[PDB]
Subunit: 152 residues, 6 copies
Amino acid sequence: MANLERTFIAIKPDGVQRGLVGEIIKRFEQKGFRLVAMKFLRASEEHLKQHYIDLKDRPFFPGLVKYMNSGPVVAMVWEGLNVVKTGRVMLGETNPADSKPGTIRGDFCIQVGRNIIHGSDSVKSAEKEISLWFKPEELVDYKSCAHDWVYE
Amino acid sequence: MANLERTFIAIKPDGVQRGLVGEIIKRFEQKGFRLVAMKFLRASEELVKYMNSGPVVAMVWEGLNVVKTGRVMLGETNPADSKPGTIRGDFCIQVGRNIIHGSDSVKSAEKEISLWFKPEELVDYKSCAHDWVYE
Amino acid sequence: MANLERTFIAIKPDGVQRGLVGEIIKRFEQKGFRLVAMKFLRASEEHLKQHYIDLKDRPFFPGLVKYMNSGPVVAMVWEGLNVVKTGRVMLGETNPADSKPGTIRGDFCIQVGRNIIHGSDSVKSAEKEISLWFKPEELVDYKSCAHDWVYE
Amino acid sequence: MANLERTFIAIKPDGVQRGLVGEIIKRFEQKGFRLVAMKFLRASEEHLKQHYIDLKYMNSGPVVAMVWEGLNVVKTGRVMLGETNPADSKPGTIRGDFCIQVGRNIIHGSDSVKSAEKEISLWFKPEELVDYKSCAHDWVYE
Amino acid sequence: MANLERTFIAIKPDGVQRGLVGEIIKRFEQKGFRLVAMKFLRASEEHLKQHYLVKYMNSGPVVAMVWEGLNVVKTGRVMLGETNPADSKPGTIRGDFCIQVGRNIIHGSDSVKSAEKEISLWFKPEELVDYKSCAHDWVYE
Amino acid sequence: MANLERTFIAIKPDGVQRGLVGEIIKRFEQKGFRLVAMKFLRASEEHLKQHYIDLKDRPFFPGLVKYMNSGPVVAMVWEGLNVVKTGRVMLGETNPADSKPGTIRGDFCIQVGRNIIHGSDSVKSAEKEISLWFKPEELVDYKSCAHDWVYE
Ligand SMILES: [Mg+2]
Ligand SMILES: [Mg+2]
Ligand SMILES: [Mg+2]
Ligand SMILES: [Mg+2]
Ligand SMILES: [Mg+2]
Ligand SMILES: [Mg+2]
Ligand SMILES: [Mg+2]
């Protein structure tokens, strides 16, 4: 079913440091998506290199990896219809300069190197990142009491 | 006069069920529109089983270009296209459960108001901030 | 059953005029109570003298009635366990001067003659106010999707 | 130092189900406490509390387990939750704002420092407790 | 008239630094009080309090304000919560936002006479703005 | 460095009268911009004529000046990367009819003559307006504790 699509959302160290964890989680809860998994950790450099491997030939990659390791992140899996694309809409443009008011980035940050949050860009990237950051024992299954009111 | 335009806004059963009535009314109040009428009822059958499935909040709101601006504030009818910052953009996912309905035109609005409300349920009063919302 | 207890809540003309209808309804929704009935009207002075009949000899009664007729009110019936007592706690003390931060009155008003809201003071008074303001066909029955998570 | 005290906070399945995870975390963040650990798991209140009364808990469901740090965070956390029985909780507290019945009181917090250390030992591995410094620490503490 | 009482409220550097100016102002506005004056300046808490142990803040930004309304001195104090955040209730500014008395983010006058003294000391008379709120008749009888 | 750009934001008399000062300041604070200057005043007509001199001969110029003088305003200077353009995005379109939900004007007002807020349209206008409304002693300097999490 399309309603079982999952995406990986990570609140970056600046999101934690500036006290935005609750605000972000609230936006996803109130949209109607279901929290599947969540943990709080300092990701190692090797872990972050595997996560950002597609960008290793980019000039900012050394900085990116350093900053993603400079504090703890909140790693999460969320489930719902088109949650990948829709979550990307909710985050706003990757460059906060282009993000619109009402989006997470549009409301809460300024510079691309401090854009507080990451979300999977595709279903395939989503499954790879979910597998990288979480094990199957860490995924929680339940039915939201409001399911029949969110979905037809 | 253009400032006395009215629109019909109905919160559907999924909006009542998920606890969104207060937020919706708040967005309309803080925009500067005036509540003209409101009632809470079960939608009788005159799809359409689904709107009887629960209660609806029927409302009439007044203000300049309130029909179109209301539609903007609701967001696109299909939540998949709704922008963050709109009611549907913030709170729902699927068109069959898009929690709210607003009139699409002035004539539609006056038809819906006649159909859902009696004329005496439409309350006339002046907002104490009217001179600060309108010139 | 104790969970089917109902109370009458009325947002007074100053609550409407100062744009607090949404905030108040939101507080009752998020507490877990079920909206049973709601309408918007300018109550007649006759109606208001019947509502406040117990205070007809008080010095402020004529002014109270006039002010309650000077604008529209939002009349509501809400349902839940100990909703009369608990709704009164949520409103704050009837005299805003003694209302606490976190309550409706404590957060939003100042003077007893402009205390923006009324709630039934007892189950008795609640049922007579419900009968005065609403017809039984105007009372809406449905089950909340979150009922099993609000009540054991 | 007293600023290094910790408490255990668990959002129960009714809190997850009614969409309150963000609100709760936000109240703790804005108070000034530091999130030390957090994970999402399935756990039953029934089985955790089955060895109890000696002579009506929620079944297995999703819970958010957390460890929070700060001065007097155990007691102040309990104040922020409000009374365990929502009927006695004051508006402005988590339970005062969001729930009605004690069997569905959406959240749990440790009632004493040693209880808190025990619960943290029970729920978390030592390596899940993350050490970092809040950028606002010097503005929360003198 | 008692409805013209005034109080002095100062947001301290920890309140500015933690991004709380808007929330605090919003609580006073929504309560129904009228903003009379406001300015943003650099001030040292030490030099001000040692001008007439908990370690006070050095020179930093403060938002100084004057608010008007019935019983605003006392009610303002209630809305701030107890001076020691350890005793502040949820729903108050200090109950919601801070932990330690030396970083209690805000100050309010403790009495009408204190309020008038501090208003004179921090503000010029022409900085006190007189206007009528459009909702005044719905806040006061 | 580009992160020190400053813009002039003014909350107009209708913004004060409808109780929006806190909401607006909150949106700027939570975005990551730094408050540099702020005061509360009734601007004189001649001050307002200087401020809007570029519009000195339009049909509405006389009305504008008289309304901007009809109540107090909150004048402010805010600092950050691209604060001029980004602040204009946050305000929404000058005409509320075109402002989008999530913007200040989109969320809070309706008509161009009552658009509750003003922001500098360019850096040059920003430097001119900041000098007109504030003297250098009124500009307050400090480093945000979160600077290193807002800027790379
Ligand atoms: Mg990045
Ligand atoms: Mg849209
Ligand atoms: Mg529709
Ligand atoms: Mg009495
Ligand atoms: Mg039903
Ligand atoms: Mg418990
Ligand atoms: Mg003090």
